[PDB]
């Protein structure tokens, strides 16, 4: 799984 | 009918469980490395030191162009997070355009759960806008640079495609996963007709859900709820990710419609597999989804639907058998809306950035059966869509 920019 | 940008076709390989990437090559002599590409973030960054799962990785010290900025970089992502030195240098895409522009490089010197064992990729191409480049909009992002620097047009379309199975890393290597048209549309990659949502903000690349819908039942929540705090399209989240009360009422609903059958809740986690006997998937019991999407004409808005060959991710059994198995590819948010690579899978996307809006119409190469198609739909009479965006 990737989860790619901080919230 | 016709596909226009053939050389950028079938340019890209991966599987939404690790990433779609696209070949580019940095430096003078040209190195080459496998990059992912990313809209949900700005940075360019590739791996500049070994890894126990890179192959291979930027080295500055070969490249007689290579200019160091002088600067370190952090970039922490919803998962994985990476550290860097920046600097900039000459790049290309083999199967792309054919220009060479300098862009801004952040090496990759320390990192923790971002690069993937056995995903063949070995940097990020983060293709959202400078507000939310790091360390701040001062860093022009590559496509920035890509448009600013040549005659490519400020528009890009990405066309992902999963195989509706499992692919090894061999298999990967070896198989077309979609395809990056740079400064275009190809219209060999779609059917039907393309529907354009405005992009609310150029940061993210962001839109507003104004309506869901669960084999055509509507949630009926307030549509404020479906951006709560924001809604984005992310090439790099394999996931589609809906804020908290948004999945929790999608995962009654979706339960619901597909009750014939049971699973753990392990299973509507999005942490355990399940699997049918070779070929007997029940496609049929799990409900399509459906999103509508703000329109670009006043009180307008279209739909995509998906099915569960794009929801249902493939994965491999735990001993390789004959099975078919999968993991449930929505989950849960804290940051708002993902619309993921498992949505993605189903249509071609269009990153219309010049007329700030995106494009989506079903995908020639997303999975389906007899039966069911994904769908692109419109117009719907749609009131006081900006009242759904979250401020």
């Given at each position: 799984?990737?989860?790619?920019?901080?919230? | 009918?016709?596909?226009?940008?053939?050389?950028?076709?079938?340019?890209?390989?991966?599987?939404?469980?690790?990433?779609?990437?696209?070949?580019?090559?940095?430096?003078?002599?040209?190195?080459?490395?496998?990059?992912?590409?990313?809209?949900?973030?700005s940075n360019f960054?590739?791996?500049?030191?070994?890894?126990?799962?890179?192959?291979?990785?930027?080295?500055?010290?070969?490249?007689?162009?290579?200019?160091?900025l002088?600067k370190?970089v952090?970039?922490?992502?919803?998962?994985?997070?990476?550290?860097?030195?920046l600097?900039?240098?000459?790049?290309?895409?083999?199967?792309?355009?054919?220009?060479?522009?300098?862009?801004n490089?952040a090496?990759?010197?320390?990192?923790?759960?971002?690069?993937?064992?056995?995903?063949?990729?070995?940097?990020?191409?983060?293709?959202?806008?400078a507000?939310?480049a790091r360390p701040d909009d001062s860093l022009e992002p590559?496509?920035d640079?890509?448009?600013?620097?040549?005659?490519?047009?400020?528009?890009?379309?990405?066309?992902?495609?999963?195989?509706?199975?499992?692919?090894?890393?061999?298999?990967?290597?070896?198989?077309?996963?979609?395809?990056?048209?740079?400064?275009?549309?190809?219209?060999?990659?779609?059917?039907?007709?393309?529907?354009?949502?405005?992009?609310?903000?150029?940061?993210?690349?962001?839109?507003?859900?104004?309506?869901?819908?669960?084999?055509?039942?509507?949630?009926?929540?307030?549509?404020?709820?479906?951006?709560?705090?924001?809604?984005?399209?992310?090439?790099?989240?394999?996931?589609?990710?809906?804020?908290?009360?948004?999945?929790?009422?999608?995962?009654?609903?979706?339960?619901?419609?597909?009750?014939?059958?049971?699973?753990?809740?392990?299973?509507?986690?999005?942490?355990?597999?399940?699997?049918?006997?070779?070929?007997?998937?029940?496609?049929?019991?799990?409900?399509?989804?459906?999103?509508?999407?703000?329109?670009?004409?006043?009180?307008?808005?279209?739909?995509?639907?998906?099915?569960?060959?794009?929801?249902?991710?493939?994965?491999?059994?735990?001993?390789?058998?004959?099975?078919?198995?999968?993991?449930?590819?929505?989950?849960?948010?804290?940051?708002?809306?993902?619309?993921?690579?498992?949505?993605?899978?189903?249509?071609?996307?269009?990153?219309?950035?010049?007329?700030?809006?995106?494009?989506?119409?079903?995908?020639?190469?997303?999975?389906?059966?007899?039966?069911?198609?994904?769908?692109?739909?419109?117009?719907?009479?749609?009131?006081?869509?900006?009242?759904?965006?979250?401020?």
């Amino acid at each position: 799984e990737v989860n790619x920019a901080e919230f | 009918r016709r596909g226009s940008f053939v050389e950028m076709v079938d340019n890209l390989r991966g599987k939404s469980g690790q990433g779609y990437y696209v070949e580019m090559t940095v430096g003078s002599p040209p190195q080459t490395l496998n990059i992912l590409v990313d809209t949900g973030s700005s940075n360019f960054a590739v791996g500049a030191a070994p890894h126990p799962f890179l192959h291979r990785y930027y080295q500055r010290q070969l490249s007689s162009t290579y200019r160091d900025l002088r600067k370190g970089v952090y970039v922490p992502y919803t998962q994985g997070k990476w550290e860097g030195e920046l600097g900039t240098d000459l790049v290309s895409i083999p199967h792309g355009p054919n220009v060479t522009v300098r862009a801004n490089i952040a090496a990759i010197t320390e990192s923790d759960k971002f690069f993937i064992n056995g995903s063949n990729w070995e940097g990020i191409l983060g293709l959202a806008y400078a507000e939310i480049a790091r360390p701040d909009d001062s860093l022009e992002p590559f496509f920035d640079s890509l448009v600013k620097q040549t005659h490519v047009p400020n528009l890009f379309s990405l066309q992902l495609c999963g195989a509706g199975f499992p692919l090894n890393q061999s298999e990967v290597l070896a198989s077309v996963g979609g395809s990056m048209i740079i400064g275009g549309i190809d219209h060999s990659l779609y059917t039907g007709s393309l529907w354009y949502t405005p992009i609310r903000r150029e940061w993210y690349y962001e839109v507003i859900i104004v309506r869901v819908e669960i084999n055509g039942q509507d949630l009926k929540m307030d549509c404020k709820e479906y951006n709560y705090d924001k809604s984005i399209v992310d090439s790099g989240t394999t996931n589609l990710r809906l804020p908290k009360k948004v999945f929790e009422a999608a995962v009654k609903s979706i339960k619901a419609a597909s009750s014939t059958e049971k699973f753990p809740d392990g299973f509507w986690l999005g942490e355990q597999l399940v699997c049918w006997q070779a070929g007997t998937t029940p496609w049929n019991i799990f409900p399509v989804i459906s999103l509508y999407l703000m329109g670009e004409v006043t009180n307008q808005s279209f739909r995509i639907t998906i099915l569960p060959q794009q929801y249902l991710r493939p994965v491999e059994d735990v001993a390789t058998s004959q099975d078919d198995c999968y993991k449930f590819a929505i989950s849960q948010s804290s940051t708002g809306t993902v619309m993921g690579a498992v949505i993605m899978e189903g249509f071609y996307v269009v990153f219309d950035r010049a007329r700030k809006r995106i494009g989506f119409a079903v995908s020639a190469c997303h999975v389906h059966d007899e039966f069911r198609t994904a769908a692109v739909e419109g117009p719907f009479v749609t009131l006081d869509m900006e009242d759904c965006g979250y401020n």
